[PDB]
Design an enzyme around this catalytic site. Structure first.
Site, PDB file in Angstrom:
ATOM      1  CE1 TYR B   7       6.354 -52.319 -67.609  1.00  0.00           C
ATOM      2  CE2 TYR B   7       5.772 -50.634 -66.118  1.00  0.00           C
ATOM      3  CZ  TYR B   7       6.485 -51.584 -67.225  1.00  0.00           C
ATOM      4  OH  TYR B   7       6.984 -50.503 -68.587  1.00  0.00           O
ATOM      5  NE  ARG B  13       6.470 -50.587 -73.721  1.00  0.00           N
ATOM      6  CZ  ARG B  13       7.962 -50.120 -73.763  1.00  0.00           C
ATOM      7  NH1 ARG B  13       9.183 -50.517 -72.540  1.00  0.00           N
ATOM      8  NH2 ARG B  13       8.540 -49.135 -75.096  1.00  0.00           N
ATOM      9  CD1 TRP B 103      11.156 -46.121 -74.052  1.00  0.00           C
ATOM     10  CD2 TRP B 103      11.134 -44.510 -72.602  1.00  0.00           C
ATOM     11  NE1 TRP B 103      10.282 -45.564 -74.563  1.00  0.00           N
ATOM     12  CE2 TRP B 103      10.290 -44.358 -73.725  1.00  0.00           C
ATOM     13  CE3 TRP B 103      12.005 -43.820 -70.905  1.00  0.00           C
ATOM     14  CZ2 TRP B 103       9.138 -43.532 -72.981  1.00  0.00           C
ATOM     15  CZ3 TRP B 103      11.496 -41.934 -71.293  1.00  0.00           C
ATOM     16  CH2 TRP B 103       9.599 -42.130 -72.220  1.00  0.00           C
TER      17      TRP B 103
HETATM   18  N1  LIG Z   1       5.506 -54.011 -76.143  1.00  0.00           N
HETATM   19  C1  LIG Z   1       5.524 -54.402 -74.951  1.00  0.00           C
HETATM   20  C2  LIG Z   1       7.004 -54.198 -74.462  1.00  0.00           C
HETATM   21  C3  LIG Z   1       7.608 -55.653 -73.386  1.00  0.00           C
HETATM   22  C4  LIG Z   1       8.859 -54.777 -72.699  1.00  0.00           C
HETATM   23  O1  LIG Z   1      10.142 -54.638 -73.290  1.00  0.00           O
HETATM   24  N2  LIG Z   1       9.345 -54.321 -72.044  1.00  0.00           N
HETATM   25  C5  LIG Z   1      10.790 -54.199 -70.781  1.00  0.00           C
HETATM   26  C6  LIG Z   1      10.238 -53.360 -69.934  1.00  0.00           C
HETATM   27  S1  LIG Z   1       9.497 -52.033 -69.879  1.00  0.00           S
HETATM   28  C7  LIG Z   1      10.791 -55.560 -70.504  1.00  0.00           C
HETATM   29  O2  LIG Z   1      10.221 -56.702 -69.880  1.00  0.00           O
HETATM   30  N3  LIG Z   1      12.334 -55.082 -70.433  1.00  0.00           N
HETATM   31  C8  LIG Z   1      13.189 -55.657 -69.780  1.00  0.00           C
HETATM   32  C9  LIG Z   1      13.698 -56.778 -70.498  1.00  0.00           C
HETATM   33  O3  LIG Z   1      13.484 -56.897 -71.153  1.00  0.00           O
HETATM   34  O4  LIG Z   1      14.615 -57.684 -69.664  1.00  0.00           O
HETATM   35  C10 LIG Z   1       4.478 -54.524 -73.712  1.00  0.00           C
HETATM   36  O5  LIG Z   1       4.239 -53.441 -73.621  1.00  0.00           O
HETATM   37  O6  LIG Z   1       4.362 -55.128 -73.582  1.00  0.00           O
END
Ligand SMILES: N[C@@H](CCC(=O)N[C@@H](CS)C(=O)NCC(=O)O)C(=O)O
Ligand SMILES: CCOC(=O)N1CCN(C(=O)Nc2sc3nc4n(c(=O)c3c2C)CC[C@H](C)CC4)CC1
Ligand SMILES: N[C@@H](CCC(=O)N[C@@H](CS)C(=O)NCC(=O)O)C(=O)O
Ligand SMILES: [Mg+2]
Lengths: 198, 198
Positions: B7, B13, B103
């Site tokens: 992460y 998350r 966010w």
């Molecule tokens: N509901 C999913 C959400 C996953 C998610 O959207 N993660 C984001 C960051 S918190 C992400 O990877 N964002 C960067 C991208 O989309 O490249 C979980 O809880 O794992």
């Protein structure tokens, strides 16, 4: 058990529960409210949202929590703990995308613009990731149908209303839809359910 | 099992997974990536999102799917299937609200106004619902701590950064947070963990 499902007269977020009950051949009360019932209904929901499922006098909420409850120790669950994680993860990936849409937006122009942007700029990446994940396999997870397959069919049905060409580049994802739709208990529910837009 | 969690350097998350590992005294690699390293990693991932958890080389995704996988057969699960449903439902209720916040929004005035509307108008309704749900009980579900209690403490931590008065009218929700914080393995993790805003 005695089961009473409360939702709008819509497929929406209740439909996954309705598929499960159909597939498992479980009787339940499919209670469908009108907007005019909402304030009275809402007043007794635990977190102000539907669907809820009453089970022998106790209320459950959250569509996917309820779907998971109903499928534990059935053939719709993942066959192993690992596969169960993958079922949950695919469902949440689908649900995350569906949650991006402004379903209750009153400004129709604003709502349409966002739908079209999501469906054109974001959906293709998800559809591609889903297709790559599925590869040449029969079902999303394991060797038999799971409730993740059901959820793919329900979500994609919704999305196809607004983006007819969604799956033109993904025939394997169409095939999966058709396989879910052909399961006899599911086909029967699809044929008889109230016809609603969403 | 050999666990590696990936992460960003933040609670976000992944934090629920980190609490579960601490409470259960499971060792794991807490891999925190820089933004610069992300694009390259994102391309290797089936759904292009984090957190992911590698279990003996096999990649899992979806934070709550992973959390449920880790807590099944443990004392952090609900004690009946119905209570497991309650756990799942509370967590999804909290996750739905956290996911409402933009966010990653780049339009800063639209982000700001959205945050303030969610905090001013939505948050108090949810706090009232959670307070009513908890009543005078010690934990949200059953007679002992579950990972729903962890997720409450985690979500509320971030909400309190942006809304310091969040729980002024909900002392019982404060009591719950403090109880989770006092669990020795959780206390130890909170003391030791990297200090980050989100
Ligand atoms: N509901 C999913 C959400 C996953 C998610 O959207 N993660 C984001 C960051 S918190 C992400 O990877 N964002 C960067 C991208 O989309 O490249 C979980 O809880 O794992
Ligand atoms: C399984 C994938 O999900 C769907 O297919 N759904 C399509 C229908 N969707 C939908 O219509 N959502 C609605 S319909 C609706 N109607 C009322 N409001 C609402 O919040 C909503 C919401 C959030 C609540 C407040 C009052 C009653 C105005 C209208 C839910 C997503
Ligand atoms: N993730 C929840 C979402 C529940 C939800 O937001 N339901 C909508 C209707 S589909 C609702 O009750 N809206 C009322 C409101 O937002 O005030 C679920 O799957 O049950
Ligand atoms: Mg969710």
């Amino acid at each position: 058990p005695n089961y009473k499902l409360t939702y709008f007269n819509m497929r929406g977020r209740a439909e996954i529960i309705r598929y499960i009950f159909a597939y498992l051949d479980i009787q339940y009360e499919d209670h469908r409210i009108e907007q005019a019932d909402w304030p009275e209904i809402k007043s007794t929901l635990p977190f102000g949202k539907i669907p809820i499922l009453e089970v022998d006098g106790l209320t459950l909420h959250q569509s996917l929590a309820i779907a998971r409850y109903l499928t534990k120790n059935t053939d719709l669950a993942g066959n192993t703990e690992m596969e169960q994680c993958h079922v949950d993860a695919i469902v949440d990936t689908l649900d995350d995308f569906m949650s991006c849409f402004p379903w209750a937006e009153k400004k129709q122009d604003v709502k349409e613009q966002m739908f079209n942007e999501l469906l054109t700029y974001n959906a293709p990446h998800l559809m591609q990731d889903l297709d790559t994940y599925l590869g040449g396999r029969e079902w999303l997870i394991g060797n038999s149908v799971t409730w993740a397959d059901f959820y793919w069919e329900i979500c994609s049905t919704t999305l196809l209303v607004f983006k007819p060409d969604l799956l033109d580049n993904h025939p394997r994802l169409v095939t999966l839809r058709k396989k879910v739709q052909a399961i006899p208990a599911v086909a029967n529910w699809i044929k008889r359910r109230p016809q609603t837009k969403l």
